[PDB]
Amino acid sequence: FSEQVATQEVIHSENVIKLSKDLHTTLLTFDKLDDRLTNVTQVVSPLGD
Amino acid sequence: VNNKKISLKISEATILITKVVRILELSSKCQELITERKFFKVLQNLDSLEK
Structure with missing residues (x-):
């Protein structure tokens, strides 16, 4: 009964909810990733230069 | 643990x-072995059980 459905509630609801929130924050992290990569290779033009 | 429950x-x-x-089969064999000094449903019900 609602112990198992409580695992559906907390696990499914919190898993979906913090899955979207943590994965969207991870998308902001990937925004910082390509940010630092773009500034990185853009600073690495003097390497080939 | 809901799948360990289920x-x-x-x-x-x-x-x-x-x-x-x-439990049913050994119960029937107990019904066979219980019958002493009857000797008539012995082969009938017992041979029905062994079938």
Whole structure:
């Protein structure tokens, strides 16, 4: 009964909810990733230069 | 643990069923062996059980 459905509630609801929130924050992290990569290779033009 | 719950009631149910089956057969053999000084439904019900 609602112990198992409580695992559906907390696990499914919190898993979906913090899955979207943590994965969207991870998308902001990937925004910082390509940010630092773009500034990185853009600073690495003097390497080939 | 909801699948250990459902698994526990699942295999508990199936083993309860097979336990009921062997309980029935050994119960019938007890009904056979109980009959002393009758010798008439002995071969009838006993040979029905061994079938």
